[PDB]
Structure formats: structure tokens, C-alpha cells
Structure 1
């Protein structure tokens, strides 16, 4: 049956989260997390998010029938990964498809790996080791108009980004949150140009600067605006849009810049808070319309770790601003 007409759950037979949407072969492919009711301890490091595999979803139209393509990748088959298959993304280059995924290695350190397929629907064969120089979570691999591909990544708190300031992991007794200096600039997400073969980074990883409207860095104490997780990049009318989740304040917000590396100037809210703690999205153009894919905990009766993906239309104004979406109004 067709789904996606009035902000209803796109699928109900499994729990789904963290929708990363792409247009491949004239269809929308969605690369979400597959939530399961593991019953694992709940805490601020996110041990209750104990996902173990990915299912790729696809739609030929919006609204439209959603196809579940089965298990595309299983943690038991990723040699380096021990637990927690968190939010993935995909990219397409030269007839191959690449699935990028965060997971904990055997030392309990989040890394980002790649798995390869001949189809956007998978299944995917993981590389035996994670990407060299990767760390933390939430990859978004963005193909720019010039054919260059960039990975945006990172997440604080349970995502461990705050433990990577020196190029070495600070350790399991290091900060559980951020820099713990609220008057310093907040931690920014990470970016690296991808290698030609899509399996590695082509440069040393860089940090993205996010500034306010006056050009001042967004500060660590500014939880309404500072980066938490779920970086996403899209382009509209020559402007680069960095959007992300603010975590403990539950917003998707956005900031604009003139190139992939920024700096990005904070503009406003994309999506107000949803049912459940997390908020995670993607923004994609399909048949000349822009869509915001997102999730909430509505299907599970409000359980933060059992989510369902949803979609709605997103409106850019010609001046580059985006209309804020409130999830439960229309």
C-alpha cells in the first residue's frame, strides 16, 4: 500500500530510524538504522541503541509503496565491529554503491567503515577494517556538483567526538559529553574529501566552524544551536546547507556557507522536537520537490530507542531560508 501522504510511519513491520535518503536509478533509496527492542541498559552513552543490521528501503514515488530489501549488512559479518550499528549513509560512484556505517570496534571505540555493492539495494560486502583516520559516528557522504565526494561525520556524548581532539582517542574515562568549556567554541562536525576509490580519506580530517549571524563561533554552552550529531549536507541555488541535530535540545537546525568546508552561519530551525529523545533527518530533491525525511517514537508508544521513519515536504524560499517544520501541527 502507498505510504507518505500525511506524516504517517513509512513502515510499521520493523522499527526504523535515522533516514538517509538518496535518488539512485530514479527511485528514492533510504538507508536507516534498524531499531530493535534489545532491552539493554539505558544511559547517556546510548547503550540502549543496540542495533545489529541494516535494511535498505526504496520508494518509486512519494507517497508510494515502500520496499524492504531485506538485510543489507549484518554486524556478525563485519570483521572489525563488535557492537552498535548506528546511522548509515550511501553513495554511488562509477556503477558501485558504498554503504558507510558507524560501529564500535573491539576496543569500544566508534569507527566508520565502508561496505560495497553493485546495487543501491545491497547487500553490501564490508571492508575488513574501518576507514583509516575515521572515528565517531553519523557519516553523511555528499556528492558535490563538481564530482567530488565528502564525508561529514561526528557525534558528541555517546558518539565520542569529544574524545578526539589530538588525533588519539582520549580514553573511556575521558569526557562523556563535550569539551566542558561552555565559553569556548563548541565542537564542530568533521569533514574529509573521499579518495577516488571511495574506501579512504583523501586528506587529513578537518573540523567545520559554525558561527552565529555576527560571525562569532557558536559556543559550547549554546545547546539550542551547537552541533550534537546527524550532520547532513545539501546544496540549493549555489549555497551549501549544513544541517544537524542539537541532541539534548532536540532540534534539527541549519547553517549556510559557500563551500563544502564552511564556515557555516547558523540560520534557524529545520524541524522542531519530535516524540522521543532523538531527532534525525535527511533532505533530498526528488522529481523537483524537496523532502525532509525524519523519525519519531510514535509507533512504539514513545520509546526513544524504537523509532519509525516519516517524510514531509520541505520548502526553501528563494532567499535561501527554509521554512521551519513542526511535526504535529497539520
Structure 2
């Protein structure tokens, strides 16, 4: 049946989270996390999120029937992975499709791997090792207008970004949260231009600066605005929009800049807090309308780790500002 009409769950037969939506072959393909009721301990390191595979979803229209293409990748077939298949993303180049995914290696350190297919629906064959120089979580692979592809990535707390300040993992006894200096600039998300073959980074990883309207860095203590996880890039009017989750304050927010590397100036809220702790989204144009894909814990009755994806229309103003969405008003 058709789905996505009135902010209802897009699928109910499985739990789904962290929707990354793309337009490939005139369809919307969605690359979400596949939530399962593992019943593992819930804590601020995210051990309750113990996902083990990915299903690709597609829609020919919004609203529309949602197709579940089955298991596109299973952790049992990823040679380097130990546990926890978290939020993935996809890219298309020269007739090949690339699924990028964060997972903990055998030493319990998050890395980002790639898997390859001839179809946007998968299934995908994983590379035997993760991307060299990758770390932390939540990749968003963005194809710019000029044909260059960039990976945005990172997540603090359980995503371990705060343990990579030196370019090497600081260890399991290092910070469980952030830099632990609230008066210093907050940790920024990461960016790297992708190699021509889409399997590696083409440059040393850069950190993105996010500033307030006065041009001052967003500080570590500013949990309402500072980067937590779920980086996403889209463009409107030639302007670059870095959006992201703030985590413990439960917002999707956005910041704007004039190039992929920033700096980005904080503008405001995309999505107010939902049912359940996490908030994760993507923003995509389809048939000349812009859509915000997101999730909540509504279908499971509020369980943090059993989510469902939803969609709603997103409105840019001509000046580039975006109207804030509150999830449960209409």
C-alpha cells in the first residue's frame, strides 16, 4: 500500500532508523539502519544499538509503496568487522553503487568500510578492510555539482570521534564524550575528498569549523548547537548546507557555507526532538520537492533502539533559511 502521506511509519514489518535517502534511476532509495531487539545493555556508549545487517528500501513516489529489497549486506560477510552496523550511506559512480558503513573492527574501534554492487538495491560485496584513514561513524557521501565526491563523517560519545584527535585511536580508556573542555571550540565533523575509484580518501582528513552568526566557534559546552553525529550535506541556491544531530539535546540543526569544507555558520533547527533519544535525518530533492527523512521510536512504544523511519516535506525560503519542522503538530 502507499506510505509517507501523514508522517506515518514508512515500514512496520522491520524496525528502521537513520534514513539516508538518494535519487537513483528516478526512484528514492533509502539506506537505513536495520534495528533489532538485541536486548543488550542500554548506556551512553550505544551498546543497545547492536544491528547486524542492512536492508535497502525504495519508493517510486512520495507517498508511495515502499519496497524492501532484502538483506543487502550482513555483518557475518564483512571480514574486518567485529560488531555493530550503524548508519550507512550510498553513492553512485560510473554504473557502480557503493555502500559506506560504520562498524567496530575486531579491536572494538569504529571504522568506515565500503561495499560494491551493480545495483542501487544491492546486494553489496564488502571490501576486506575498512577505508584507510577512516574512523568513527555516520558517513555521508556527497556528490557535488562538479562531479567530486566527499565523505562527511563522525560521531562523538559512542561514535568515538573524540578519541581520534591525533590521527590514531587514543584507546578504550580515553574520553567517553568529547574533548572535556567546554570553553574550547566543539569537535567538528570530518571531511575527505574520495578517490576516483570510490574506495579510499584522496587527501588527509580535514575537520570542519562551525561558527555562530558572529563568526565565533561553537563551543564544547553549547550542546544545543554543537555537532554530535549524523552529518549530512545538501545544496540549495548554490549554498552548502551542513546538517547534523546534536545528540543529548535531540535536535537536527543546520549551518551554511560556500564550499564543501566550510566554515559553516549555524542558522537554526531543522527538526525538533522526536519520540526516543536519537534523532537522525537526511534531506533530498525528488520531483522538485524537498523531503526530510527522519525517525522516531513511535512504533515500538518509545524503545530507544527500535525505531521507524518517516518522511515529511521540507521548506526552504528563497533567502536560504529553512522552516523548522516539529514532528507531532499537524
Normalising by structure 1, report the TM-score.
Answer: 1.00
Shift of 1:256: 0.1
Aligned to 2:170: 170
Report the Cα distance in structure 1 between the residues aligned to 2:166 and 2:83, rounded to whole angstroms. 25
Equivalent position SS for 2:19? strand
Aligned to 1:119: 119
Report the Cα distance in structure 1 between the residues aligned to 2:44 and 2:329, rounded to whole angstroms. 30
Equivalent position SS for 1:155? coil
Shift of 1:269: 0.0
Report the Cα distance in structure 2 between the residues aligned to 1:91 and 1:59, rounded to whole angstroms. 17
Equivalent position SS for 2:248? helix
Equivalent position SS for 1:82? strand
Equivalent position SS for 2:76? helix
Shift of 1:24: 0.1
Report the Cα distance in structure 1 between the residues aligned to 2:243 and 2:212, rounded to whole angstroms. 14
Aligned residue pairs, count: 330
Equivalent position SS for 1:121? coil
Report the Cα distance in structure 2 between the residues aligned to 1:72 and 1:168, rounded to whole angstroms. 31
Report the Cα distance in structure 2 between the residues aligned to 1:40 and 1:139, rounded to whole angstroms. 24
Shift of 1:146: 0.1
Shift of 1:9: 0.1
Shift of 1:328: 0.0
Shift of 1:186: 0.1
Report the Cα distance in structure 1 between the residues aligned to 2:270 and 2:76, rounded to whole angstroms. 36
Equivalent position SS for 2:323? coil
Aligned to 2:191: 191
Report the Cα distance in structure 1 between the residues aligned to 2:43 and 2:219, rounded to whole angstroms. 25
Shift of 1:231: 0.1
Deviation sequence 1:135-157 (CA, Å, 0-9, x none): 00000000000000000000000
Shift of 1:90: 0.0
Aligned to 1:293: 293
Report the Cα distance in structure 1 between the residues aligned to 2:230 and 2:131, rounded to whole angstroms. 19
Report the Cα distance in structure 1 between the residues aligned to 2:210 and 2:83, rounded to whole angstroms. 31
5+ unaligned residues in a row in structure 1: which ranges? none
Report the Cα distance in structure 2 between the residues aligned to 1:129 and 1:219, rounded to whole angstroms. 35
Report the Cα distance in structure 2 between the residues aligned to 1:152 and 1:250, rounded to whole angstroms. 20
Report the Cα distance in structure 2 between the residues aligned to 1:204 and 1:97, rounded to whole angstroms. 24
Superposed, which structure 2 residues align to 1:137-216 within 5 Å?
137-216=137-216
Task: Could you list the structure 1 runs, at least 4 aligned residues long, displaced by more than 3 angstroms after superposition.
Answer: none
Shift of 1:33: 0.1
Report the Cα distance in structure 2 between the residues aligned to 1:279 and 1:51, rounded to whole angstroms. 17
Deviation sequence 1:89-142 (CA, Å, 0-9, x none): 000000000000000000000000000000000000000000000000000000
Report the Cα distance in structure 2 between the residues aligned to 1:156 and 1:220, rounded to whole angstroms. 11
Shift of 1:66: 0.1
Normalising by structure 2, report the TM-score.
Answer: 1.00
After superposition, the CA RMSD in angstroms is 0.2
Report the Cα distance in structure 1 between the residues aligned to 2:252 and 2:19, rounded to whole angstroms. 13
Equivalent position SS for 1:158? helix
Deviation sequence 1:39-94 (CA, Å, 0-9, x none): 00111000000000000000000000000000000000000001000000000000
Report the Cα distance in structure 2 between the residues aligned to 1:255 and 1:90, rounded to whole angstroms. 23
Equivalent position SS for 1:173? coil
5+ unaligned residues in a row in structure 2: which ranges? none
